[PDB]
């Protein structure tokens, strides 16, 4: 369960994904998320009425080779966001920067 | 020469008329020098102005039937200031009345309600009670029912127009099509689902198969007897969203702070 939550970039996952992933019935999902929050492996909330489990904290983990590559990707995308924004704001309001 | 054109119209070959008009256009230079170009009228001058008008008139009418827009607009353009000038002395005719009706029907067919209302102001005094409303009545009525948005009345007027056709059919056939596009627009905002029958009834098709055909041309899929207006409308907005004009028209909240500051500091 923790592996899947780490690599997935979205911070909410439906219960159906966990049930098929883990080869456990859906009854057993509620036990497992509960056991996990108590151990403190993960923190979050359980919504039965959207059938989501919302993680809000993940415990540090080793960062495999493959994963080092992933970080670079997320940061490259965020470079472009900073950069495109800065351009507009450099251009507009040229009159005053003093 | 000048009379050969007048008799060519009555013959019924309106293509003969058209081939003969480049020669008679040369003679139209002469008629123009005879009249002082609308700067004082006398009894020499009323005949001269009269001949000029006859040649144009059978041309106006011939062009309309042969769907030759250009010629009609020009000929008519001339007729308009001539008739407008002066006090009555022969500056109105039965031909005037017919010609203005046909003209107004072209404007309804292009769906240019902007010019139609303006054109009516220019025309106004002449058609108040000195040609009255007799044939001119046909577009006046027509404007009224589509403003109210009773499409039922409008539609009925065009079909019943069969007994009024004299060359009116060149605008009347078109004006059916215009009705179909206006209604088509409306029915999207209302609902997403209409049965087959209902689509035909509002849009006034006489054939159910022709209905489904029109739906493809209108870029609507009808599936299992139900329209699915849902597709294209959404698609169009997504397509509109990519263009270039585009930042200030869309309006960015970021831009609001930047514009406010430079005002002050100027």
Swiss-Prot record, chain A:
* Keyword Nucleus found: no
Biological-process GO terms, alphabetical: proteasome assembly; proteasome-mediated ubiquitin-dependent protein catabolic process; ubiquitin-dependent protein catabolic process
Superkingdom, according to UniProt?
A: Eukaryota
Molecular function as annotated in GO: structural molecule activity
Hydrolase is among the record's keywords: no
Entry's Gene Ontology cellular component terms: cytosol; nucleus; proteasome complex; proteasome regulatory particle, lid subcomplex; proteasome storage granule
UniProt keywords (A-Z) are: Proteasome
Write out the similarity annotation.
Belongs to the proteasome subunit S11 family.
- Protein purpose: Acts as a regulatory subunit of the 26S proteasome which is involved in the ATP-dependent degradation of ubiquitinated proteins.
Further remarks about this protein from its record: Present with 12400 molecules/cell in log phase SD medium.
Could you identify this protein by its name?
26S proteasome regulatory subunit RPN9
Q: Which organism is it from?
A: Saccharomyces cerevisiae (strain ATCC 204508 / S288c)
Q: Which residues of the full protein are shown?
A: 296 to 393 of 393
Swiss-Prot record, chain B:
List GO terms (cellular component aspect): nucleus; proteasome complex; proteasome regulatory particle, lid subcomplex; proteasome storage granule
InterPro entries attached here? 26S_Psome_Rpn12, CSN8_PSD8_EIF3K, PCI_dom
Asked whether the keyword Signal is assigned, the reply is no
Q: What's a GO biological-process term for it?
A: ubiquitin-dependent protein catabolic process
Every copy of the PCI domain together lies at: 70-245
Q: Keyword set for this entry?
A: Proteasome
Kindly give the Pfam families that the UniProt entry links to this protein.
Answer: CSN8_PSD8_EIF3K
Q: What else is known?
A: Present with 9890 molecules/cell in log phase SD medium.
What is this protein for, i.e. what is its function?
Acts as a regulatory subunit of the 26S proteasome which is involved in the ATP-dependent degradation of ubiquitinated proteins. Necessary for activation of the CDC28 kinase.
Q: Which family, according to the similarity comment?
A: Belongs to the proteasome subunit S14 family.
Q: Which protein is depicted?
A: 26S proteasome regulatory subunit RPN12
> What is this protein's gene name?
RPN12
């Amino acid at each position: 369960l923790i592996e899947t939550v780490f690599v997935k970039n979205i911070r909410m996952l439906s219960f159906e994904d966990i049930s098929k992933a883990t080869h456990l019935p859906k009854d057993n999902v509620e036990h497992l998320v509960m056991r996990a929050i108590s151990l403190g492996l993960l923190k979050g909330s359980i919504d039965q009425v959207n059938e989501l489990v919302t993680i809000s904290w993940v415990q540090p983990r080793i960062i495999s080779g493959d994963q080092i590559t992933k970080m670079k990707d997320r940061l490259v995308e965020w470079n472009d966001q900073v950069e495109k924004l800065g351009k507009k704001m450099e251009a507009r309001g040229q009159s005053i920067w003093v | 020469l000048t009379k050969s054109l007048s008799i060519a119209f009555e013959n019924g070959d309106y293509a003969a008329c058209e081939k003969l008009l480049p020669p008679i256009k040369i003679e139209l230079i002469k008629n123009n020098l005879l009249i002082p170009d609308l700067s004082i009228q006398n009894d020499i001058y009323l005949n001269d102005l009269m001949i000029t008008k006859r040649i144009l008139e059978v041309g106006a009418l011939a062009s309309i039937q042969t769907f030759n827009f250009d010629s009609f607009e020009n000929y008519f353009n001339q007729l308009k200031p001539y008739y407008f000038s002066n006090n009555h002395k022969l500056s109105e005719s039965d031909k005037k009345s017919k010609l203005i009706s046909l003209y107004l029907l072209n404007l309804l067919s292009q769906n240019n309600t902007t010019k139609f209302h303006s054109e009516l102001q220019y025309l106004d005094k002449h058609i108040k009670n000195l040609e009255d409303d007799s044939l001119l009545s046909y577009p006046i009525k027509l404007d009224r029912w589509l403003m109210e948005g009773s499409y039922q009345k409008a539609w009925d007027l065009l079909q019943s127009g069969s007994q009024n056709i004299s060359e009116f059919d060149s605008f009347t056939d078109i004006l059916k099509s215009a009705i179909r596009d206006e209604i088509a627009k409306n029915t999207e905002l209302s609902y997403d689902f209409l049965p087959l029958s209902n689509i035909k009834a509002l849009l006034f098709f006489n054939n159910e198969k022709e209905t489904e055909k029109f739906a493809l041309e209108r870029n609507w899929p009808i599936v299992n007897s139900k329209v699915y207006f849902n597709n294209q409308s959404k698609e169009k907005a997504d397509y509109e969203d990519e263009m270039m004009h585009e930042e200030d028209q869309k309006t960015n909240i970021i831009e609001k702070a930047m514009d406010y500051a430079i005002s002050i500091e100027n």
